[PDB]
Amino acid sequence: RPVDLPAVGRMRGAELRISAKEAAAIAREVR
Amino acid sequence: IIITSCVMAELEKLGPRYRVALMIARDERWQRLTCDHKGTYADDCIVD
């Protein structure tokens, strides 16, 4: 499995797609 | 967190796609032991 995938969202080429659910989850991990 | 030289050899010999992880291996703060064998089979190395 590719090392070069960060652990957040799906990528199509260089477009890393993030949902608002994922972003709000990041905010929750901050909180 | 030591890395046998055989393991370092295996992770270079793997494709360029793991270059970041190879760098992380390559880090200098962690000690190293050489080996005396022929041809880079990591599992045999560690178990020995």
Partner: protein
């Protein structure tokens, strides 16, 4: 069609990285892309570039670029949130950089730490 000519350029950029070509031709160009190339040359993934008009850009590289990517929803982020976004994007906290449009302009997470500003994450490189 892909309206982010930014990401289209960076697609070509990672394509040149994968194909070992030491140059590119960003056929439609713009200043935010130029600023991104300035920061990538600030920390040295790229050798040197220039822009020509009829406008396109040629960029000579090393090989020490691994990946460039864009944050498509263009998210907002603050300081402790910057630390969390850093660790949830990058492999290790001392490699690569993320790309943050601040009110002071465009800068990395390291420059954002130096100047203590929040802003919007739009992309990254490692």
């Amino acid at each position: 069609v892909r309206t982010s000519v930014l990401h289209d350029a960076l697609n070509s950029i990672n394509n040149a990285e994968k194909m070992g070509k030491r140059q590119v031709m960003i056929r439609p160009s713009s200043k935010v892309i130029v600023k991104f190339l300035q920061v990538m040359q600030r920390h040295g993934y790229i050798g040197e570039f220039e822009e020509v008009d009829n406008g396109k850009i040629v960029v000579q590289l090393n090989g020490r670029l691994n990946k460039c990517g864009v944050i498509s929803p263009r998210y907002n982020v603050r300081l402790a949130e910057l630390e969390k976004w850093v660790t949830k994007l990058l492999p290790a906290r001392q490699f690569g950089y993320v790309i943050l449009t601040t009110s002071a302009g465009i800068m990395d997470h390291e420059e954002a730490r130096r100047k203590h500003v929040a802003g919007k994450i739009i992309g990254f490189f490692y």
